[PDB]
Amino acid sequence: EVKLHQSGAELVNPGASVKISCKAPGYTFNNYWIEWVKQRPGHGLEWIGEILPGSGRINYNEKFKDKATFTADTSSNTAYMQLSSLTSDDSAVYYCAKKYGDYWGQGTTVTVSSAKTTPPSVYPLAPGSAAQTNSMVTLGCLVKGYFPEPVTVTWNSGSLSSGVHTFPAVLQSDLYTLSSSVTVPSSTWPSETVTCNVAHPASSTKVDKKIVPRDC
Amino acid sequence: DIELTQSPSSMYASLGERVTITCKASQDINSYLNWFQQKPGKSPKTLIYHTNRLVDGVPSRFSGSGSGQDYSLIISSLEFEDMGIYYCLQYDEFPYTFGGGTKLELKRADAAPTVSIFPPSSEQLTSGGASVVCFLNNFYPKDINVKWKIDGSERQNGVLNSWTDQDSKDSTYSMSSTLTLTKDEYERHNSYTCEATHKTSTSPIVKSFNRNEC
Numbered sequence: 001e002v003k004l005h006q007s008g009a010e011l012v013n014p015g016a017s018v019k020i021s022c023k024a025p026g027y028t029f030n031n032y033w034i035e036w037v038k039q040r041p042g043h044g045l046e047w048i049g050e051i052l053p054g055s056g057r058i059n060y061n062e063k064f065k066d067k068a069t070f071t072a073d074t075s076s077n078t079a080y081m082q083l084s085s086l087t088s089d090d091s092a093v094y095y096c097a098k099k100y101g102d103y104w105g106q107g108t109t110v111t112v113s114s115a116k117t118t119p120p121s122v123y124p125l126a127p128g129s130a131a132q133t134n135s136m137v138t139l140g141c142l143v144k145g146y147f148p149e150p151v152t153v154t155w156n157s158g159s160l161s162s163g164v165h166t167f168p169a170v171l172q173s174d175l176y177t178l179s180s181s182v183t184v185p186s187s188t189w190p191s192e193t194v195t196c197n198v199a200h201p202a203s204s205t206k207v208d209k210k211i212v213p214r215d216c
Numbered sequence: 217d218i219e220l221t222q223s224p225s226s227m228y229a230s231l232g233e234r235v236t237i238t239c240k241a242s243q244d245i246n247s248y249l250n251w252f253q254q255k256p257g258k259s260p261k262t263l264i265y266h267t268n269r270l271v272d273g274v275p276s277r278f279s280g281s282g283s284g285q286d287y288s289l290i291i292s293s294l295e296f297e298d299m300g301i302y303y304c305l306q307y308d309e310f311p312y313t314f315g316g317g318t319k320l321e322l323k324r325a326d327a328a329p330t331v332s333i334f335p336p337s338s339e340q341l342t343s344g345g346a347s348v349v350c351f352l353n354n355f356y357p358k359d360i361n362v363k364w365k366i367d368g369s370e371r372q373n374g375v376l377n378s379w380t381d382q383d384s385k386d387s388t389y390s391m392s393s394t395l396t397l398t399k400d401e402y403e404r405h406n407s408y409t410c411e412a413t414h415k416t417s418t419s420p421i422v423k424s425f426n427r428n429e430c
């Protein structure tokens with residue numbers, strides 16, 4: 001799948017800077033150019049520049065000349081890209097890639113915003129008492145009012161992965177809302193319990209919510 | 217900059233059909249043209265470099281061709297795992313540049329959505345909000361309309377929608393629609409309804425509950 005390892009998501013104020021790492025393991029770090037690419041949602045891909053670690057050779061796209069700064073450290077097989085005087089046109093996913101074969105990082109999301117970090121509220125979605133007894137039942141989690149992205153959502157700590165749709169977050173004002181559904185056999189719920197797990201690393205929050213049938 | 221225009225900008229094709237997408241450069245790029253595949257929420261992956269060379273492990277159904285300004289990527293027999301967005305890149309002159317991408321979506325049998333409505337949790341009502349959620353899952357094709365009704369009357373503000381990309385298992389699409397009110401608003405009405413209208417029927421699929429029960 002992905003062969004290079006990038007640093008994690010970042011929330012940074014407008015005007016400030018971030019430094020993203022790209023780790024490239026292997027004995028030949030100085031033999032390969034590292035490319036840096038920008039992707040804003042809805043837009044396509046865009047080339048930022050490249051660096052050849054250990055050579056003093058670097059090529060910038062003109063458009064990012066004063067925005068990106070590339071360095072590399074050869075003893076740790078790690079390339080860096082600093083992005084400076086950030087504005088909201090800089091909010092995007094950034095990738096690094098070797099200039100050879102299929103060697104891409106997982107990407108690094110950057111959010112340029114001075115909005116406040118806010119933990120989510122996690123709400124269960126259990127079927128109404130207008131209870132439809134087809135042979136499958138759908139349950140859900142609403143994950144509301146958080147900032148920044150991402151949260152990760154799982155079901156029974158990862159053990160339940162079939163029947164799951166986790167929907168992209170939507171940004172309303174300066175807060176995200178996201179929902180996840182899971183569909184399971186009717187015979188098996190509620191007797192075999194279903195719990196949603198939500199992690200919001202930016203607020204150092206984790207919430208677990210058992211989906212319980214509605215009472216009265 | 218060299219400009220790359222990809223055509224078509226999106227495509228539908230069935231399992232086993234041949235597929236051809238094109239990349240046109242604004243000047244001669246002397247065969248320095250790569251192709252990448254990007255799936256929803258994943259990183260890009262390198263398929264073809266220098267017009268027509270396969271990266272190791274790339275399946276044989278892929279090939280590339282072209283010269284001067286006109287390049288193509290060809291899939292000889294389409295597989296379900298070939299869904300995604302395809303990008304060309306030229307490396308003849310700095311700055312290197314990508315095309316705008318071609319989205320490739322897989323055909324399949326029509327399928328109505330499975331629609332579920334959920335009242336607000338009692339937990340959320342304690343904070344003074346009330347979100348009503350409607351899931352429209354595993355439908356094809358992607359085009360769908362969701363309409364919310366409070367006591368028989370259409371409602372449009374406070375509604376937030378989110379679509380999935382094409383499912384990697386069954387090639388369907390899903391959607392989530394959340395109607396957010398205040399608890400005060402929510403407690404004043406009785407009947408809440410989401411109506412989905414999809415290509416498969418001229419009757420909307422209607423799902424609703426009455427606040428008066430648990």
Ligand SMILES: Oc1ccc2ccc3c4ccccc4cc4ccc1c2c43
Nearest residue numbers: 035037097098099100101250262265307
């Ligand atoms: O000649 C080449 C052989 C393999 C390549 C693999 C990846 C990339 C690449 C990836 C991201 C951004 C720009 C890139 C440019 C090249 C250019 C040549 C090349 C390869 C490239």
